[PDB]
Design a protein around this ligand. Structure first.
Ligand SMILES: Nc1ncnc2c1ncn2[C@H]1C[C@H](O)[C@@H](COP(=O)(O)O)O1
Lengths: 520, 122, 61, 122, 122, 32, 61
């Protein structure tokens, strides 16, 4: 009925010995996009050209972690458990209120239209292109008491060449072609979903460095050739070759059982403006050209933080493109001069297992040495996976995405979003929503032309998302106290992680999940 | 059948082996005799008989912009070695797609020489 | 003349993986610095890396 | 088994050794793999090949993650204390035993290929 | 060529190594590859070296007193340790410009590769 | 009731070995 | 009970008020005493003594 609420606002976290369940609700506003029509989209810009469509529909996105975890909760989670992975989810939209706007002259009036319908469907079948997954605004806001605007749905189409235009292959997906539920106030929508078994994300830092796992005290039983000649001078000395049983201490020489990492090199820049070479953002030598990129169908796509690699700590004066950058509290606009106002994610913790972003993978003999010809070593920058390699994935972040859909392709290797998160073949479905059109008074004599005059409307209501996370406690045997993340903030005039006098809420730092320790 | 060749020179090692078909039991037929056999393939990935209607590099929603920022330029101007020193960072906006941090890398790859069907060009 | 032959082609694959005659991409092959310019290396051979997705060669009649 | 604990008098010039019957040696094996594994790589200490050779049990020492080119410890570095684990205490006449089951693993190949990959064709 | 064991150009620098957290760790016999037979006059770091009966101390001048493991058998399936993986066109040939081939030294796994693992030893 | 929708918008095509079923919905305006 | 949600038009000079029927006010009481208790000391906001007196719900701080 019109008079009855169709759902209660509950946001909660319930913790278990084995599983924690998060639940949060938010209020949303839904405009009328593109005055009700699908629009072709395309621009051709050389290293950017793209093509696609913009839709009258909007969608709900809960892909950021902070959507379901209050800071404290995130804390609880990461200081206590080694791994976590999502198990099941369920969503419900309710208290739909459709508003109609009179828009008188000078003043715009708004009043409820009780008999109006907003339509929601979610598609399981994954027939619509998935977009919820990468790098984008629209997720519910972290702070509960913040109303948000449902994002408009638009999708990309395959672009052939450096020039944007469409081939027969390009396709059009029309949301109205799908069956969807129609609601009015007093109507509600609900759906459930079960995640697929997925590797627990590792929420620990290695307490051992891969290269040396051996017993410091003993020495291998293998021998290596130590020197072709005597002395410490490169090209002089007595001819004889000498072999020696690998002894305790010459660890760098120990034959090991594993190779540390897959790797792609990244350019490095210094946070101090002064240190960098001059590089423009446009023109023949715009930065893009010098930053590690992957050429695809004639178009440079700059590699996103790439195959997981070690990166300078957050405080460090140098930073690489490999690390993710978050706004930070103080920044006002879209652009800023000093990087002291930004937040940098860093994977120092990964260093124990795999190569550094700005440094190389290693160096290989790139030549066959000989008495008359000197040995030459080649610098290796790109290294595909090799038998016996072991690496760590990029960590997840409080404000980082949670899942991402694994491309529907013949081949994929070690799916783990590179931006961080769990790779799913069938990820939480995008739930679409749109305000049904309505018509302005219409002409008395019939005209075939499609109607174009519509009443102005917008809707609002609350959505509630609940996720059941499966986690695993630590159970370590380490004796010395671990590192844990605790605020440690100095005396503050207006406390952190809280709304302020203005009433504004902003997240102070970016937070990872690897504080606990574990050995290899 | 082929045998393993060691070196650039063909010759055989002890490793090389000889397989003699007569050493296997086989059915003998005459007119009026027939032979038959059956077999079951093993579960195998369906071959993909489709073309992708999306280009990997851009799967994102054209309309929105990432919430991550990247450093756009170490200096001002459009000239390679001149400009004001300051570094500038900017929130990745709709349109600068080539810059969007993505979740996946496109391909395993080995380069191949290329030739032109027009005799003249090579 | 190759006009008498038939060529198979994998244009369709282009959406997911690199071109045969062109390269995989270009990597920073160096640590830039105010006194030293940035150098990019051309990558020709690329083994599989975590997060890669590709299509297989098509079948033919 | 057959644990024999010896005690040494160590007189001047001459060292004497005699059994101490009531003395305990403690053994535990950890399944939980909570202690860093070292048995695995490149190291002496395995039982000797020839049966009639007595051997010296290896001392247990473990490595910690080293950050940088300089050795020093970070908070991350950890300390594992063996006494913190429950272990069995034996005296002569006491014995210890344990069992374990390997996990299914690919048979190691104990053959040499009689064909060269590059040419398998007819 | 003459190479010292210490100093700026100690052997370590020229032997294939993997840089980890600022520290060279010399690659242990690496991803399985073919290696010269045991008798051969040339040997690579890829092969494992065992003492051998006659050797008295921790160090020895002549390698005739050592034992070398070798993976000749693997040669049928994968590349040689000292030689390269292959050579790729590293360029787009043209009537006015000659074709250039690049020497490939490091090759990550590619779809369709098949290799053998290093053998086990007594 | 005034508050409840009286039907859902489903447009669909379901294909069978022998028969295909089409279904589509639209919104309309009716003057006087 | 008898929740009545009002919406105000606020025209120029004159402010108009009309019912919005579909609007929600949310109430919870917490048993768990997880929120800081304040009801207890020295403060205005209690229901008025005289029955026929309408009162303004106190703001929580
Ligand atoms: N996040 C995520 N989603 C899906 N699949 C993943 C993920 N991370 C790793 N993997 C895959 C990669 C390999 O297919 C497999 C190896 O299992 P392992 O147990 O890791 O040896 O796990």
């Amino acid at each position: 009925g019109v008079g009855n609420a169709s759902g209660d606002w509950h946001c909660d976290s319930t913790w278990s010995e084995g599983k924690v369940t998060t639940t949060s609700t938010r209020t949303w506003v839904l405009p009328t996009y593109n005055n009700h029509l699908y629009l072709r989209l395309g621009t051709t810009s050389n290293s950017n050209t793209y093509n696609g469509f913009s839709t009258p529909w909007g969608y709900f996105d809960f892909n950021r972690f902070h959507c379901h975890f209050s800071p404290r909760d995130w804390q609880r989670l990461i200081n206590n458990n080694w791994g976590l992975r999502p198990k099941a989810m369920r969503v419900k939209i309710f208290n739909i209120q459709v508003k109609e706007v009179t828009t008188s002259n000078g003043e715009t009036t708004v009043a409820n239209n009780l008999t109006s319908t907003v339509q929601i469907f979610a598609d399981s079948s994954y027939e619509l292109p998935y977009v919820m997954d990468a790098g984008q605004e629209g997720s519910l806001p972290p702070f509960p008491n913040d109303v948000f605007m449902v994002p408009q749905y638009g999708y990309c189409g395959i672009v052939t060449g450096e020039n944007q235009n469409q081939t027969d292959r390009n396709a059009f997906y029309c949301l109205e072609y799908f069956p969807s539920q129609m609601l009015r106030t007093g109507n509600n929508f609900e759906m459930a979903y079960n995640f697929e078994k997925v590797p627990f994300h590792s929420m620990y830092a290695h307490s051992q460095s891969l290269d040396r796992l051996m017993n410091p005290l003993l020495d291998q039983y293998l021998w290596h050739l130590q020197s072709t000649t005597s002395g410490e001078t490169l090209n002089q000395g007595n001819a004889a070759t000498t072999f020696g049983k690998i002894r305790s201490g010459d660890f760098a020489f120990y034959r090991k059982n594993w190779l540390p990492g897959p790797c792609v090199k990244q350019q490095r820049f210094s946070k101090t403006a002064s240190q960098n070479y001059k590089i423009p953002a446009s023109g023949g030598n715009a930065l893009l050209k010098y930053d590690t990129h992957y050429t695809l169908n004639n178009r440079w796509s700059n590699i996103a933080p790439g195959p997981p690699m070690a990166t300078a700590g957050p405080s460090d004066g140098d930073f690489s493109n490999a690390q993710l950058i978050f706004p930070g509290p103080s920044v006002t606009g879209n652009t800023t001069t000093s990087a002291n106002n930004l937040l940098f994610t860093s994977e120092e913790e990964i260093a124990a297992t795999n190569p550094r972003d700005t440094d190389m993978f290693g160096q290989i003999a790139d030549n066959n040495q000989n008495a008359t010809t000197a040995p030459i070593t080649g610098n290796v920058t790109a290294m595909g996976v090799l038998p016996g390699m072991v690496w760590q994935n990029r960590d997840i972040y409080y404000q980082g995405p949670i899942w991402a859909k694994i491309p529907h392709a013949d081949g994929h290797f070690h799916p783990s979003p590179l931006i961080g998160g769990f790779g799913l073949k069938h990820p939480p479905p995008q739930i679409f929503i749109k305000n049904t059109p309505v018509p302005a008074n219409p002409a008395t004599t019939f005209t075939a032309a499609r109607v174009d005059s519509f009443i102005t409307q917008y809707s609002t209501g609350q959505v509630a998302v609940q996720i059941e996370w499966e986690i695993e406690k630590e159970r370590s045997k380490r004796w010395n106290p671990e590192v844990q993340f605790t605020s440690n903030y100095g005396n503050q005039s207006s406390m952190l992680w809280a709304p302020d006098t203005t009433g504004k809420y902003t997240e102070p730092r970016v937070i990872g999940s690897r504080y606990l320790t574990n050995h290899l």
